Amino acid sequence: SATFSGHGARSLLQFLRLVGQLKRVPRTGWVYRNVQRPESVSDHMYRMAVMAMVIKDDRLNKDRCVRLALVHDMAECIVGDIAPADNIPKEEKHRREEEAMKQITQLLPEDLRKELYELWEEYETQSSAEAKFVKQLAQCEMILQASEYEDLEHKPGRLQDFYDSTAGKFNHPEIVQLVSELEAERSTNIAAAAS
Amino acid sequence: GARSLLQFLRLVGQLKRVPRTGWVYRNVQRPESVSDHMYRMAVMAMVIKDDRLNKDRCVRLALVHDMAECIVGDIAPADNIPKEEKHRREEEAMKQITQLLPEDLRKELYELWEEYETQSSAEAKFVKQLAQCEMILQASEYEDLEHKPGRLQDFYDSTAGKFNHPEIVQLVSELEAERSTNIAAAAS
């Protein structure tokens, strides 16, 4: 084993406590931009999961998309939310999160360890159409939230850096249309504020 | 279309800014959001065993059941809102929220909410037990974080006898034993 915490009720409860730490990991991107009361990582995954339900693609297993949305950032309960500004090399971030996912999932019975760990791997390696879709949900959810913070602050355009970072990251036809609509509305508000 | 979908998602996003009222009224610092609560419930649906249940349906129930709160807010027992009035408000809200979706999705999400509201399936009953379990777990977590063991006992008292799912009963028993050991320790 790694540790010897067993696969009974005590470890299931501890798994749930670790998952609960996600409520107390603020999303670092917003922290570093001085957003007041920023969302948690679980807030972020929650809306992604709903987005997987309501943004259509008949070619995808949406049950799997929902599960991927709910599991993909789970390592952050241990690792925290590493942002670009933290300058952690991709390989190191991978190593930390993989080791964390091993620690987290080993608290579960073998069948559930396997499922959750394999969901995480599917997302990390972007090995499926479902994974690639969910990654675009993540980026879309982020820029939507950016626009929402700008609106709440009455500072249109303040969080432009987030939009710039999503350049050429979108290709799913439904998400592309959602993003175009979002950027149009936002840009309308920016222009309206300018006059 | 995309515009209405965006409007729907902004409404859903409001859940991030609805604090769970039970904790607010107990002076918890930085209390969890309603979406925080549904998030962990959804993960619980995945990891708490029941081979008789449609688990992905349980996941969706967890993610939809409190969704009306984006318009209604999180009504707590201390708010003294009659059951019928709360139901009326949340039903009206869900109709408003879901009407922003295309037909098939409007129907699905509304029917999920309704299934949980009316507790009309084994899945709904399971998810209601997840909700209560998630709540008392969070109560003990705040007690631990505050270093005020037992402070939120009222939440435990409110769930007394409300658990009957065998796996959830096991988890709850473990939780209460660990917590009571902590309280007993503090009491000495």
Swiss-Prot record, chain B:
PROSITE patterns given in the database record: HD
UniProt-annotated binding residues for a divalent metal cation 1: 37, 65-66, 131
Annotated keywords: Acetylation, Cobalt, Hydrolase, Magnesium, Manganese, Metal-binding, Phosphoprotein
CC cofactor: Mn(2+); Co(2+); Mg(2+)
The keyword Phosphoprotein belongs to this UniProt entry's keyword annotation: yes
InterPro entries: HD/PDEase_dom, HD_domain, YfbR/HDDC2
Enzyme Commission identifier(s): 3.1.3.89
Cofactor-binding details, from the entry: Binds 2 divalent metal cations. Shows activity with Mn(2+), Co(2+) and Mg(2+) but shows no activity with Zn(2+).
Residues where a divalent metal cation 2 binds: 69, 74-75
Entry keyword Phosphoprotein: yes
Reactions catalysed: a 2'-deoxyribonucleoside 5'-phosphate + H2O = a 2'-deoxyribonucleoside + phosphate
Alphabetical list of Pfam families matching this protein: HD_3 (PF13023)
SMART domains per the UniProt record, alphabetical: HDc
Domain HD: start-end pairs: 34-136
GO molecular function, one term: 5'-deoxynucleotidase activity
Description of how the protein assembles with itself and partners: Homodimer.
Function: Catalyzes the dephosphorylation of the nucleoside 5'-monophosphates deoxyadenosine monophosphate (dAMP), deoxycytidine monophosphate (dCMP), deoxyguanosine monophosphate (dGMP) and deoxythymidine monophosphate (dTMP).
Family label: Belongs to the HDDC2 family.
Protein name in UniProt: 5'-deoxynucleotidase HDDC2
Organism placement in taxonomy: Eukaryota, Metazoa, Chordata, Craniata, Vertebrata
Gene (UniProt): HDDC2
